[model samples]
Target: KVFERCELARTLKRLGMDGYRGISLANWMCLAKWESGYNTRATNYNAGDRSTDYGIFQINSRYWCNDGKTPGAVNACHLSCSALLQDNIADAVACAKRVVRDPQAIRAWVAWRNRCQNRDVRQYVQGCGV
Candidate 1:
């Protein structure tokens, strides 16, 4: 889960967003622990839907597979070159970029995290700048 989240973080960092790009590694580590406890195959039985939400980030496959086939309305499929290949860095970064493009999206994420248990976010990433 840490590796995958790191990949995602790296990907998001490349997108040129001061928010995610500047996100601290400590905070990201906290997110990984809170998201899935480092379990890539983790799932929630009553997570809103049938618990189709899988992986460390619990990124619903439905929302992920929006680029292609309908794996399921509750499944967000990831890409082979990304998630499958453990390249979540790029996938996650791309995903973050896409969402961060909209101010509300980032803000929503922030709000969600604030209410969630991963409130240990840092003011800045180890080597990032806003």
Candidate 2:
């Protein structure tokens, strides 16, 4: 259901993703949970108190408009990783699609999480195959 809703399978197919979708999705979901508790509109009470890393990505505020283009990156939304924390699921999904390009690299959260558990989660999370 989720895979179909996000067309995650299709996206992975287009990216030539290997056999790591389950683990990857789990890890990504973990991140979302850890970051926002799955609440798109959730905001850190202590946020901005120190930095502007807003939204689900919690991206640094400095990067939001460091381009010296105008008022700031927040002006165009492109520079704002805040969209990742939007109340809209589509926004979060789109942001994820843009952020996670590789399915095999360690930088990829799914692959990273699968192995992060020291292989214990590999078999359990991914099982035998896609």
Candidate 3:
């Protein structure tokens, strides 16, 4: 589902992510915007590495979700990458939580590291009432 910024903020907060592990709503909002613009079906194929980033979180096929074509994909999420394309984001949320628990944390996402990290993201949800 394509989420409005405010809707996403409210949903994330209700899902126990308001201040998860020191990550704030602003950070999450910023990451989502930069990653997929809140589009659940967003997908990007990196020609250089032949890997795909899927869904709103842009979960990488190289490590988390299995795309079948990606040989030796770790499939840590134990789910098909296509699952992330659906509007039902429960699985995506579950997998993202697992990704954040890894040593890299949100740094697993280059966009988050470059754009969201250490940046003021209050504008992401400026009047969301989150």
* Candidate 3 residue lDDT tens string, 7-87: 988887877777777778888889889999999999999887888999989999999999988767789998999988988
Would you list the clashing residue pairs of candidate 2? Answer: 24-110, 56-85, 64-73, 65-73
Task: Estimate the TM-score of every prediction.
Answer: 0.47, 0.43, 0.93
lDDT of 2 by residue, 35-85 (tens): 544455554433434434345434333433222332333322354444545
Superposition TM-score, candidate 2 onto the true structure: 0.43
- On TM-score, the candidate that comes out on top is 3
> Which has the better TM-score: candidate 1, or candidate 3?
3
Query: Tens-digit lDDT track for model 1 on 1-130?
Result: 4454444445434554334544544554455456566555565444455424445444544555332333354222334313622424445445544544455553434424764335545532344332
Q: What ranking emerges by lDDT with the best candidate at the front?
A: 3, 1, 2
Query: Deviation in angstroms for 118 in model 1?
Result: 9.7
Once all C-alphas are superposed, what RMSD does model 1 give against the true structure?
5.7
Model 1 whole-model lDDT (C-alpha atoms): 0.45
RMSD of 3: 1.2
- Identify the superior model by lDDT, candidate 1 or candidate 3: 3
